[PDB]
Amino acid sequence: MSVSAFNRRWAAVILEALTRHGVRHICIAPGSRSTPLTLAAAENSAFIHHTHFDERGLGHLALGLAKVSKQPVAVIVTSGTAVANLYPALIEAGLTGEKLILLTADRPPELIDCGANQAIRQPGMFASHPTHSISLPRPTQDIPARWLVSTIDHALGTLHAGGVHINCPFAEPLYGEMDDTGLSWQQRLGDWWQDDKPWLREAPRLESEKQRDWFFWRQKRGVVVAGRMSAEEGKKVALWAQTLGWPLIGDVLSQTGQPLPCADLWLGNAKATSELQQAQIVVQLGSSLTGKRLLQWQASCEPEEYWIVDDIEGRLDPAHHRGRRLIANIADWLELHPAEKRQPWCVEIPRLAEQAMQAVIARRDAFGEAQLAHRICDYLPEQGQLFVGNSLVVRLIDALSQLPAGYPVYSNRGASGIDGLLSTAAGVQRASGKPTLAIVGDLSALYDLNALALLRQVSAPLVLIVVNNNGGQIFSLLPTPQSERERFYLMPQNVHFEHAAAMFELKYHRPQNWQELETAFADAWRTPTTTVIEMVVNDTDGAQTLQQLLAQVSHL
Amino acid sequence: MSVSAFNRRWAAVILEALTRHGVRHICIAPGSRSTPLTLAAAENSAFIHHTHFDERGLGHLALGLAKVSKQPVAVIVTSGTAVANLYPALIEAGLTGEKLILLTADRPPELIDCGANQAIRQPGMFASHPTHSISLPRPTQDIPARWLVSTIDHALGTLHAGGVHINCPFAEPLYMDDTGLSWQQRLGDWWQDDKPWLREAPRLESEKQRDWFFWRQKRGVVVAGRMSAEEGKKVALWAQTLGWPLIGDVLSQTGQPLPCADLWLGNAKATSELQQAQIVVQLGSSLTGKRLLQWQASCEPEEYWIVDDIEGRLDPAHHRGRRLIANIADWLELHPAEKRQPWCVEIPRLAEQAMQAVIARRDAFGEAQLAHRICDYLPEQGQLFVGNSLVVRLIDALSQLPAGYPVYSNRGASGIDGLLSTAAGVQRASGKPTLAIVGDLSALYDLNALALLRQVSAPLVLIVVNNNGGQIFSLLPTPQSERERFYLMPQNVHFEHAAAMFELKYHRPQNWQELETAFADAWRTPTTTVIEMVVNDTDGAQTLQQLLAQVSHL
Ligand SMILES: Cc1ncc(C[n+]2csc(CCOP(=O)(O)OP(=O)(O)O)c2C)c(N)n1
Ligand SMILES: Cc1ncc(C[n+]2csc(CCOP(=O)(O)OP(=O)(O)O)c2C)c(N)n1
Ligand SMILES: [Mn+2]
Ligand SMILES: [Mn+2]
């Protein structure tokens, strides 16, 4: 009988299946072909529903939700280039861990490759990027519901990390009276409908094993490198490293309090690198290192062994040292391999890190972006959240600032895309319900400008800083050629964000000094709304301040 | 010795190569990894260079440029999600033919699957979507320049239609010696030449149909889909000669001698008279209107033919018939019309009556009336760019565009995600005064492409119809309780600040007289003007349904 109603039972089974794997959040874009999924989502009370009109944005929103909640988040799009728009976030998820569940509506087999409207080849479209790909058959009562749910349960239970693409063909008639056409079809699942378990539970844990020679390795001259990890882990890492007596190089992404701050500077001094040559083991916890100096030192250092511990699969060392690649939750790992008290071995790096910070403090007064990067700890909301954007900002904070241990930092530093930052910020705040400082460059805000539509709906204050240095000035930092520099690298767009804010009825400030920035913040934090704070600066000031400080610190 | 230099030498061969296959335009997005490619492209005065910060918009800009010039258009992006942002445009290319050449930078093989920054798996990212995909190896002088250029020449020379993915890995130092020189000079006078190194240029064509003189005396229908504007004119004369009724889509440029087909095709007396068609000849594809697609699906002529310069099946109802691959103008010459007498006498009445049913409603200030009135606004010697959702459908159903008036669109996949950047492409390509029309969500999706509309060579009027949400979901029989939140998604916004941000003239007319003025002024400078038509949310869909019914009864 009714195809429009069976379409829905079929959809209804998919969505309800996801509930049993901790999918609370679901992101939905508009369309027709997606009707069965979207109706099923709307009916399902177990969901918190988020919507957006830009499918790349929706993709990053879902990324932000998952990045924070550490749950899997579902997405629903109709067919066509809507599906293609998930690719960026999907790629990002694939590198950093977010469990993104992409339910992509499709045309049925009959309407593919025959010049039907809005009909592309969907299955296999994201190549190896998703962790699991499921390519569903034309819907039919001749396939038991037990097959449908099992297929989902398998993909969701074995998901360690990364995306899942679940392609969903539906034949038209999409709309009609909801008959009771697949009701007994669904009832073959019995009291599963009233359960909270999966239909099929398939949930192996993947974990490296206790390193049984650790007692010898922990007593060697070692260096701790802290990359991306959770707030709590950052504190754990710092106490552990200190116990061991090893120098901790901690990234902005790390939340360890960076007890040797300005590593991107001091790592530039030869006295620092001589000392580090003595290290026999490096233990890196987390990955996605930020700073240039760190990436170099890490690429050139020659310890006996190099260990990377993180809870995502695959090689994480881009310089391919002899060593170990250890899959584990970082907190469990610290516990499974406790530190033992040893007398610190580094005499000269601790003094160098203080001299480096001193040198930065000396230059804190100018109203530039490197200074803003430096001061950023003074502007973090209490009980709040920092989301840090790509390009200069993340580098500057990493180089010029010492962020507090355990203070939550968020980012897209997998593929480092400047394409999703605002919509990602939105999902980040909606996930925790926390006050949010997001900081982003001018090209970046333009790139995801329409995500300001999302930012009209936040549950706690959000402050979006837009550092506007008229272009991508990262490329003033890099030794790019002066002749095509401007039109082909910087691409200034000669724009401001007063109107952007006005369009989405968001508060706006363009502060011209430290007192006006603080006033702006003070106003901002008062309401559960987004405030745009554009900081206008001389385009090359930030990039030069870094080069100068780099050279200065390298002399000490 | 120097890697930097050889990286540049290697990229210059790639880019020079492309000069030889008709590539004039190259669109570039910013990046460091792309340095080799971008510098080589900067140097080469054979290209017009276009830039943009949004890689998805840059893809559709290219798409726009290609759509109109009918040349291949090159693209450069850096590694990472930049590349992934090209996917929507490639896919649209793959469907409708634009030749997009995607030079996408990559890190070297040593740097993949090892947690390097901005390093993803790039070869095959786009699956079956490009027509060719070259995955270049790591640059080395051990592969001679000849191999590199041959590979490109094969890909381009044999390219009938669609995108080419060229993944170009580069190891770094990225930032010049004589390193790659003698290695380049192995190409001899090819550097001062005009032609590919290897020419591989097979023609792909369907043979003349030897039974044409038999069929052309039968009861035929002619269906005109997307084609060139000149082709629209020739198809018009052709069907007119034959005495066959011409159903011409908005994209056809036929002059639609039987307009409002989406309306009159719901009249039983029209279906009845078409039920006598022994042959249907369709030229072009991507037909717009619902009723047309239904009439197609259900008709049973002895033969259904589709003529178009793209490959693959094009008939979604899968009739017994022929799929003929040809330039349409060439195909009309080859299968010339016999001056017979019109065999349809009632359809001409209904098409006339349905258009009257429309003018009886032309007065309100609504989107359905704008769609209908739209030729009064067409720039002289200009070109129309029609966006998606309601606009294309209402214009196809209620208007009569003139024969030969160039119409452009994205009706392959029908994405609402690249309409503004595509339109900018359309304008830059032809240098013509342009009218582009777009929904409110559409304008929101590609909002940042207004940066692109600050550099236009002639007046561009951008009409944003704002009915507050995707109102096509009030046309479609969607469940009323979920429709606002889960289909319609009103964003409760206007475009005044959007325009002003990018330094573009703006109007929000509240009547026909105000609109006229805005238009009249707008055409007097080489700049983009934004015109926002605010209309009651559901009036367009409502109007159209009521016109369907009305026509359906008479
Ligand atoms: C989607 C994407 N495209 C391109 C890049 C290359 N890219 C890296 S930084 C940058 C500049 C962005 O400029 P902005 O956001 O204004 O900040 P700034 O460099 O001035 O700090 C670009 C284009 C990228 N990382 N991601
Ligand atoms: C990239 C993309 N995502 C989703 C769709 C599905 N879709 C088709 S029409 C439409 C509504 C667009 O609204 P406006 O652009 O506001 O159109 P209108 O009011 O005429 O419906 C949508 C979301 C699409 N065609 N392309
Ligand atoms: Mn910038
Ligand atoms: Mn709309």
**Could you tell me if A311 lies within 8 Å of chain B, comparing CB atoms?**
no
Q: Give the relative orientation of helices A349-361 and A541-553 as an angle to the nearest 10 degrees.
A: 140
How far, in Å, from the CA of A65 to the mean position of ligand 3? 26
- A108 to chain B: closest CA residue: B316
Per-residue burial over B302-332, b if 16 or more Cβ lie within 10 Å, else e, is ebbbbbbbbeeebbbbebebebbbbbbbebb
Q: Which residues have CB under 6 Å of ligand 1? A: A 390-393, 416-419, 441-444, 469, 471-474; B 30-31, 55, 78, 80-82, 85
**Same-fold call for A212-337 versus A347-556:** yes
Q: Which atom of ligand 2 is nearest the CA belonging to A32?
A: 6
Long-range contacts (CB closer than 8 Å, 24 or more residues apart) made by A510-515 = A510/A534, A510/A535, A510/A536, A511/A535, A512/A367, A512/A536, A513/A367, A514/A367
Beta-bridge partners for A103: A76, A166
According to DSSP H, which parts of B80-144 are helical?
81-84, 87-96
Q: How far is CA A504 from CA A86, A196, A500, in A?
A: 24, 40, 7
Distance from C-alpha of B380 to C-alpha of B383, rounded to nearest angstrom: 8
* Ligand number nearest to the C-alpha of B30: 1
CA gap B119, A184 in Å, rounded: 49
What residue in B sits closest to A289 (Cα-Cα)? B117
How far does the centroid of ligand 1 lie from the alpha carbon of residue B530, in Å? Answer: 28
Is beta strand A507-509 parallel, antiparallel or unpaired with respect to A530-536? parallel
Residue type for position B485: R
CB pairs under 8 A between A and B: 240
Helices (H) and strands (E) in chain A, counts: 23, 17
B80 phi, psi to nearest 5 deg: 105, -150
Amino acid at B72: P
Q: Please compute Rg for chain A using Cα positions.
A: 25
| Residues A394, A372: Cα–Cα separation, whole Å | 12
How close is the Cα of A77 to the center of ligand 2, in Å?
12
For residue A386, which of A55, A67, A62, A26 has the smallest C-alpha distance? A67
Q: Distance, in angstroms, between A343 CA and closest chain B CA?
A: 33
Q: Give exposure, A496-535, as e/b (b: 16+ Cβ within 10 Å).
A: bbbbbbbbbebbbbbbeeeeebeebbeebbeeebbbbbbb
Domain boundaries, chain A: 1-196, 212-337, 347-556
Q: Does B535 lie at the interface with A, CB-CB under 8 angstroms? A: no
| Ligand minimally distant from the alpha carbon of residue B487 | 2
Nearest alpha carbon to residue A125 among A100, A102, A148: A102
3-state secondary structure of A88: helix
Ligand 2 centroid to residue B473 C-alpha, Å: 9
For residues B552 and A554, what is the distance between their CA atoms, to the nearest angstrom?
Answer: 83
What CATH number should be reported for the domain whose range is B345-554?
A: 3.40.50.970
For ligand 2, atom 20, the nearest C-alpha belongs to B390
Q: What is the DSSP letter of A403?
A: P
**B interface test, pick of A38, A44, A131, A488 with most B CB neighbours within 10 Å:** A488
Question: B210: buried, middle or exposed (CB in 10 Å: 19+, 13-18, 0-12)?
Answer: exposed
Chain B hits for A318, CB-CB cut-off 8 Å, are 111, 114-116, 119
Q: Was domain A212-337 assigned CATH 1.10.10.10?
A: no
Residue A491 phi, psi dihedral angles, 5° rounding = 35, 65
| Residue B457 near residue B433, CB atoms below 8 Å | no
What pairs with residue A410 in β-bridges?
Answer: A387
How many C-beta neighbours within 10 Å does residue B64 have?
Answer: 32
CB contact under 8 A, B448 and A453: no
CATH class entry, domain A347-556: alpha beta
A interface test, pick of B87, B315, B388 with most A CB neighbours within 10 Å = B87
CA distance B51 to A485: 13
For residue B489, list chain A residues with Cβ-Cβ distance below 8 A: 30, 51-53
Distance CA A285, CA A263 (A): 16
- The fold adopted by the segment(s) B1-194 is Rossmann fold (3.40.50)
Whether residues B127 and A125 touch (CB distance < 8 A) is answered with: yes
The DSSP bridge partners found for residue B84 are: none
Q: Whole-angstrom Cα distance, residue A282 to residue A261?
A: 18
Give the experimental resolution in Å: 2.5
Nearest to B447 among A92, A315, A449 (CB): A449
Closest approach of chain B CAs to the CA of A487, in angstroms?
8
Tell me the CATH architecture of domain B210-335. Answer: 3-Layer(aba) Sandwich (3.40)
Which atom from ligand 1 is nearest to the alpha carbon of A443?
16
Chain A residue numbers with beta carbons less than 8 Å from the beta carbon of B126 are 127
Q: Which of A80, A90, A109, A81 is nearest to A27 (CA)?
A: A90
CA angle (B329, B335, B339) in 5-degree steps: 105
Interface test with B, best of A106, A117, A290 (most B CBs within 10 A): A117
Q: How far lies B352's CA from each of B230, B262, B312, B399, in Å?
A: 25, 13, 36, 12
Q: Tell me which of B32, B33, B81, B86 to substitute to probe ligand 1's pocket, judged by most ligand atoms within 8 Å of the beta carbon.
A: B81
Backbone angles phi, psi at A327, to 5 degrees: -85, 115
Task: Give the C-alpha separation, B384 to B406, whole Å.
Answer: 6
What amino acid occupies position B434? T
C-alpha count within 13 angstroms, C-beta hemisphere, residue B243: 13
Method: X-ray
Q: Is the dihedral of CA A440, A444, A450, A451 positive or negative?
A: negative
- Å between A395 CA and nearest CA of chain B: 13
What one-letter code names the amino acid at A339?
A
Q: Chain A: residue nearest B318 by CA?
A: A114
Contacts of A126 in chain B (CB under 8 A): 127
B478 vs A: CB within 8 A:
yes
The answer to whether A317 contacts chain B (CB < 8 Å) is yes
Distance CA A237, CA A225 (A): 9
Residues surrounding ion ligand 4 at CB below 5 Å: B 439-440, 467, 471
Chain B residue with minimum CA distance to A42: B482
Question: Reduced to 3 states, what is the DSSP secondary structure of residue B165?
Answer: strand
CB-based contacts of B320: which residues, under 8 Å, 6+ apart?
Answer: B302, B303, B304
* Helix ranges restricted to H, B122-189: 145-157, 181-185
Detail the DSSP E strand segments found in B29-85.
Answer: 48-51, 73-77
Q: How far apart are CA A18 and CA A6, in angstroms?
A: 19
Distance separating alpha carbons of residues B498 and B500, to the nearest angstrom? 6
Residue A234: its H or E element: helix A231-244
| Tokens describing residue A462 | 């959000």
Helix (H) or strand (E) holding A429: helix A421-432
Query: How far is residue B104's CA from residue B14's CA, in Å, rounded to a whole number?
Result: 12
CA of A151 to the centre of ligand 2 (A): 31
Using the mean position of ligand 2's atoms as its centre, give its distance from the Cα of residue B475 in Å: 12
User: Residue B413: which of A118, A317, A416 has the nearest Cβ?
Assistant: A118
Q: What's the CA-to-centroid distance between A443 and ligand 1, angstroms?
A: 7
CA separation for the pair A180, A1 (Å, rounded): 9
d(C-alpha A81, C-alpha A62), whole Å: 18
Residues 6 or more apart whose CB falls under 8 angstroms from that of B345 comprise none
- Measured in whole angstroms, the distance separating CA A295 from the mean position of its chain's CA atoms is 20
Question: Chain A within 8 Å of B213 (Cβ-Cβ)?
Answer: no
The edge-to-edge listing of strands for the beta sheet with B321-325 is: B246-248, B220-224, B279-283, B303-308, B321-325
Residue A28 CA to ligand 2 center (angstroms) comes to 13
The CATH fold assigned to A1-196 is Rossmann fold (3.40.50)
Q: What are phi and psi of A100, to 5 degrees?
A: -95, 125
Count of beta carbons in the 10 Å neighbourhood of residue B524: 9
Q: How far is the C-alpha of A79 from the C-alpha of A89, rounded, in Å? A: 17
